[PDB]
Design a protein that fits this description.
This is part of a larger assembly, with one copy of chain A and two copies of chain B.
Chain A lengths: L2 H32 L4 H4 L3 H16 L11 H11 L8 H20 L15 H9 L4 H34 L9 H4 L16 H31 L41 H7 L5 H10 L10 H6 L17 E3 L7 E3 L5 H21 L16 H10 L4 H4 L11 H16 L3 H12 L10 H13 L18 H4 L5 H18 L17 H9 L10 H8 L7 H16 L17
Antiparallel strand pairs in A: 1-2
Helix pairs in contact in A: 1-3, 5-7, 9-23, 13-14, 14-20, 16-23, 21-22
Chain B lengths: L23 E3 L37 H5 L10 E6 L1 H4 L9 E3 L37 E3 L13 E3 L17
Antiparallel strand pairs in B: 1-2, 2-5, 3-4
The chains are: A mainly alpha, B little secondary structure.
PDB class: viral protein
Keywords: Coronavirus, Spike, ACE2, Mink, Protein binding, viral protein
Entry title: Cryo-EM structure of mink variant Y453F trimeric spike protein bound to one mink ACE2 receptors at downRBD conformation
C-alpha cells in the first residue's frame, strides 16, 4: 500500500532475490578463484550475466514510484533511490548509445594497452624492477623523464573506447545525464527541508582555510629538512622557490615523508618497539599472525573465521595454478545469524580495523542492516574512509601500552628529538591542496558553467594556464590524458576522509584519555566504558531532526577538527619551522628556485 | 527427514502403549520430574524450521512470522532440548524444497489445517496467468546455500512445550 | 496445586481462603451469635 508496505512485500522477496542472486554471484566468484573458466566469467559466466541483467530489469520492473507529496526524509530519499534506474532512464536511442558505452569499454578499459617502437629488440613486462626502484629511489633524470614517459603513454591507450565511454558520454556530460556542471549541485548541500533540521554549507570549509593558510609553515620546514635529504639525493640545484616532476620513482606513489621513512627508521640504537623485532622478542609470527595474533593484537576476541572456511582457506596468495590475492577480501551473508568473514593481516593498525571494521560494518548496517531500503547512511562523504579514518582514530598509544608497545620516550633533546617527535608529527600533519581543489571542482561541477566553443585558441591558452604547475611535459587537457582517474572510475572520493577525520579528532579525543585514562590531553579514553558504548548509541548519529549532533557525539566528542593537544605536540614544530625554512618561499617569484 | 507441517500436524499418536520405547532449555510447567506430567495423545507439531525465531517461539510475539503465518500463544510454557542440526540439514546445492507461506488471510488459533493453494493474489492484480504487477503464489520456497548459520539453519527443532493435555498420561514407574 | 502451580498465586489463594472464611465463619458465629441473643432473650422470657 504505502511505500513501506509495497516495497515491504517487494523486499521480503527482494532481499531474497537480490541478496541471494548477488550472493550466488559472490559464491561463483569464490568458485572461480578456485578454478578459472569463462563459465566462470558471467556464472561467474551465467551469474554475472544474470546479475547485471537482474539489477537492470529490477529497475525496469519496480521503477514505479513518485516523489512530490513527501515531507519526510526516509521516504523521500528511499523513493528517489528507487526511481533511480538502470538500462531505462531516458529515451530509446540515446540510452542504447549509453548501454553500449558502459559495457563496451567496461570491457576494453581493462583490455587496452600497447608497446614501444624505440629500439627494435623487445617489448615485454616491466613491473618488478621499477617497483624495487620505488622502494629505493632517489634519482634525478629518472624523476624527470619517467613522469614524462608514463603520463605520455597513458593517453591514446585510454582514449579509443573510453573515447566512446567517458569522452562521448563527456559531450553528453557537458549535458551530464543530469543537468550539468554548476549550481544544480550548488543547491544540494542545503538538504531538502527548512527551518530547524538540515545542514549548513560553509563552516567546515572556512575552518579548513583557516587551518591550511597558516599550516603552510609546516610545509615550510618539515619539507625543508626532508628537502635537505631530498636534494642531497635529488636534482642538482638549491634556492627557495622551485620546480619538480614526480611520477616514476619507479611508479606513482612517493607520497609521504612517512613513505621516505626507511632511511629514517623509528628508533636507532635500542631496537624500536616494532612489531617484527620487538614482537619476536615477544614471540609472535605470521601464520601465528592469523591465529596467535587474534591473540597477539586482538586478545579482545577477534571474530572466528568460520570453521569450514578455515579448513578450505588456502589463505595466502596462492602462487599455484590458482591466481588469487588475499588483499583484504570480505564475506558477509546475514540470514538471521550474524556472520562476517574478512581477509585481514591483524597488526595493531589492524586491531583498530578489527574493532572499527566491525565498526565500519556498524556504519554499513546503519545503511545495510536496517529495514532493507530504510538502510540509509549519514552523509555521502562517509563510505570507505570510514574504515581508514577511525583506524587512524582508534590509534591509542598508551592504551596499547596497557597492551604493551609505546614507552614514555616523548622527550625533547635536539637531534633525536627532531627525528622521533617530529616524525610522529610528520604523520599527524600531512597535506591538503590539489585534492582540495579537485573536490571543489566536483561539487561546483553539477549544473552547467563550463565553456566549450572556440576550441583551438581558448582551449590552448586556458590549458597552458590551468596546467601551469610543472611536469616535464604536460599531463593535460588538450592532449587529453587527464581523465583516467580511478576515483572517477570506481568512485572513491577523498572529502570522505576529510569529514570523517573531523569526526575522528573530536570523538577520538574523548575515546583514549576521557573515558578517564592515565595521562595527557591527546589520549582520548574508553577503558572499561560500556558507558561509552551506550553514549555512542546516544548523542550524534540518528538522523537530521536534531542531528548527527544528537545520537553519538555531544558526549563522545563534538563537531570540528582541531590541533590543540596536537599543538602541545606541535609547538616545537612551528618554532623550528619558522626558524629554518628560509630556503622555501611563498608562492612563486620565478627568480629564486632550488629546482630551477 | 520430512514432517507434517504446522497445518498438517499429525497424529503420530505416541502414547497408549506399554513404555518399552542435545542441549536442554527450560521455560514452562514444573520440569524437574518426569513421571507425573501428562502426555496423553499426540497430534505432532514438529518440523525442521529456522532457529533464529526461537525468541518468537515464546509468549507475545510480533514480526513477519507472527503477523502473516503463525504466532505463538502467550501461554506457551515448556522445557525442551535446544540443539542444532547443522551437519544434517546444512546443504550444499541450494535447497528451496522446504516451503514457507508468506501471508495469512484469517486470524487463526493453533492446531488445525489450512491448505488454501489457489493461485493466490496478494494485491489488486487480476492475475490472468501473467505474474507481476503485484502477483503472487501462496507458498514460498526457502533456499539453503552451503553456508546457512544457526538462524535459517534448522536446529533439530525441539523448541516445544510439554504442553498440558486432557487424557491420562502414559509415563510412570513401578 | 503444590505439584504444579506454586504459591505466588497459591499465597493469594490461601489469602482469599482465609479472608473468605473470616467473613463466612465470623458470620457463622455472628448470625449464630445474634441467634444466641434472640434465644437468650427467649429463655429469659420462658423462665419468667
Amino acid at each position: 500500500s504505502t511505500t513501506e508496505d509495497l516495497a515491504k512485500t517487494f523486499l521480503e522477496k527482494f532481499n531474497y532475490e537480490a541478496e541471494e542472486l548477488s550472493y550466488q554471484n559472490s559464491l561463483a566468484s569464490w568458485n572461480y578463484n578456485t578454478n578459472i573458466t569463462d563459465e566462470n566469467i558471467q556464472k561467474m559466466n551465467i551469474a554475472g550475466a544474470k546479475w547485471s541483467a537482474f539489477y537492470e530489469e529490477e529497475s525496469q520492473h519496480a521503477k514505479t514510484y513518485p516523489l512530490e507529496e513527501i515531507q519526510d526524509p526516509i521516504i523521500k530519499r528511499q523513493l528517489r533511490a528507487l526511481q533511480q534506474s538502470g538500462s531505462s532512464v531516458l529515451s530509446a536511442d540515446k540510452r542504447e548509445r549509453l548501454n553500449t558505452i558502459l559495457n563496451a569499454m567496461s570491457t576494453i578499459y581493462s583490455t587496452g594497452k600497447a608497446c614501444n617502437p624505440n629500439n627494435p629488440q623487445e617489448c615485454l613486462l616491466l613491473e618488478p624492477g621499477l617497483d624495487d626502484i620505488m622502494e629505493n629511489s632517489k634519482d634525478y633524470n629518472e624523476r624527470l623523464w619517467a613522469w614524462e614517459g608514463w603520463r605520455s603513454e597513458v593517453g591514446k591507450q585510454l582514449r579509443p573506447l573510453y573515447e566512446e565511454y567517458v569522452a562521448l558520454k563527456n559531450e553528453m556530460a557537458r549535458a551530464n545525464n543530469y543537468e550539468d556542471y554548476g549550481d544544480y549541485w550548488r543547491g544540494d548541500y542545503e538538504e531538502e527541508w527548512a527551518d530547524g533540521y538540515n545542514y549548513s554549507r560553509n563552516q567546515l570549509i572556512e575552518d579548513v582555510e583557516h587551518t591550511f593558510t597558516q599550516i603552510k609553515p609546516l610545509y615550510e620546514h618539515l619539507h625543508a629538512y626532508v628537502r635537505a635529504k631530498l636534494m642531497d639525493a635529488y636534482p642538482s640545484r638549491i634556492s627557495p622557490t622551485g620546480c619538480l616532476p614526480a611520477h616514476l620513482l619507479g611508479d606513482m606513489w612517493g607520497r609521504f615523508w612517512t613513505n621516505l621513512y626507511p632511511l629514517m627508521v623509528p628508533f636507532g640504537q635500542k631496537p624500536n618497539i616494532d612489531v617484527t623485532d620487538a614482537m619476536v622478542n615477544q614471540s609472535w609470527d605470521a601464520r601465528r599472525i592469523f591465529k596467535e595474533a587474534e591473540k597477539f593484537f586482538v586478545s579482545v576476541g577477534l571474530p572466528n573465521m568460520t570453521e569450514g572456511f578455515w579448513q578450505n582457506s588456502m589463505l595466502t596468495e596462492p602462487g599455484d595454478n590458482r591466481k588469487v590475492v588475499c588483499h583484504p577480501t570480505a564475506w558477509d551473508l546475514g540470514k538471521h545469524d550474524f556472520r562476517i568473514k574478512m581477509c585481514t593481516k591483524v597488526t595493531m593498525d589492524d586491531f583498530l580495523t578489527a574493532h572499527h571494521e566491525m565498526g565500519h560494518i556498524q556504519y554499513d548496517m546503519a545503511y545495510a542492516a536496517q529495514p532493507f531500503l530504510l538502510r540509509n547512511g549519514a552523509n555521502e562523504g562517509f563510505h570507505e574512509a570510514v574504515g581508514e579514518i577511525m583506524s587512524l582514530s582508534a590509534a591509542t598509544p598508551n592504551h596499547l601500552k596497557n597492551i604493551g608497545l609505546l614507552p614514555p620516550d616523548f622527550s625533547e633533546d635536539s637531534e633525536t628529538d627532531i627525528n622521533f617527535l617530529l616524525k610522529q608529527a610528520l604523520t599527524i600533519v600531512g597535506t591538503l591542496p590539489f585534492t582540495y581543489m579537485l573536490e571543489k571542482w566536483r561539487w561546483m561541477v553539477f549544473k552547467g558553467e563550463i565553456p566549450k566553443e572556440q576550441w583551438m585558441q581558448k582551449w590552448w591558452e586556458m590549458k597552458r594556464d590551468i596546467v601551469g604547475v610543472v611536469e616535464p611535459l604536460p599531463h593535460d587537457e588538450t592532449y587529453c590524458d587527464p581523465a583516467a582517474l580511478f576515483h572517477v572510475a570506481n568512485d572513491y572520493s577523498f572529502i570522505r576522509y576529510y569529514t570523517r577525520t573531523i569526526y575522528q579528532f573530536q570523538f577520538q579525543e574523548a575515546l583514549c584519555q576521557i573515558a578517564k585514562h592515565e595521562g595527557p590531553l591527546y589520549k582520548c579514553d574508553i577503558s572499561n566504558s560500556r558507558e561509552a558504548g551506550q553514549k555512542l548509541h546516544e548523542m550524534l548519529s540518528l538522523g537530521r531532526s536534531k542531528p548527527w549532533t544528537f545520537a553519538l557525539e555531544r558526549v563522545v566528542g563534538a563537531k570540528t577538527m582541531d590541533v590543540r593537544p596536537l599543538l602541545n605536540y606541535f609547538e616545537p614544530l612551528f618554532t623550528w619551522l619558522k626558524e629554518q625554512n628560509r630556503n622555501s618561499f611563498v608562492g612563486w617569484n620565478t627568480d629564486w628556485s632550488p629546482y630551477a | 527427514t520430512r514432517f507434517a507441517s504446522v497445518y498438517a500436524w499429525n497424529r503420530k499418536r505416541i502414547s497408549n502403549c506399554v513404555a518399552d520405547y542435545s542441549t536442554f532449555k527450560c521455560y514452562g510447567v514444573s520440569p524437574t520430574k518426569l513421571n507425573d506430567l501428562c502426555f496423553t495423545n499426540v497430534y505432532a507439531d514438529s518440523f525442521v524450521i529456522r532457529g533464529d525465531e526461537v525468541r518468537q517461539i515464546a509468549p507475545g510475539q510480533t514480526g513477519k512470522i507472527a503477523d502473516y503465518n503463525y504466532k505463538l500463544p502467550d501461554d506457551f510454557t515448556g522445557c525442551v532440548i535446544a540443539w542444532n542440526s547443522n551437519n544434517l540439514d546444512s546443504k550444499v546445492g541450494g535447497n528451496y524444497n522446504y516451503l514457507f507461506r508468506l501471508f495469512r488471510k484469517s486470524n487463526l488459533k493453533p492446531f488445525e489445517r489450512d491448505i488454501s493453494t489457489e493461485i493466490y493474489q496478494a494485491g489488486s492484480t487480476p492475475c490472468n496467468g501473467v505474474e507481476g504487477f503485484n502477483c503472487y503464489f501462496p507458498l514460498q520456497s526457502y533456499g539453503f546455500q552451503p553456508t546457512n548459520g544457526v538462524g535459517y539453519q534448522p536446529y533439530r527443532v525441539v523448541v516445544l512445550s510439554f504442553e498440558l493435555l486432557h487424557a491420562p498420561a502414559t509415563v510412570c514407574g513401578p | 496445586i503444590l505439584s504444579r502451580l506454586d504459591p505466588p498465586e497459591a499465597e493469594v489463594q490461601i489469602d482469599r481462603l482465609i479472608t473468605g472464611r473470616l467473613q463466612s465463619l465470623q458470620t457463622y458465629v455472628t448470625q449464630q451469635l445474634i441467634r444466641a441473643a434472640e434465644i437468650r432473650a427467649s429463655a429469659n422470657l420462658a423462665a419468667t
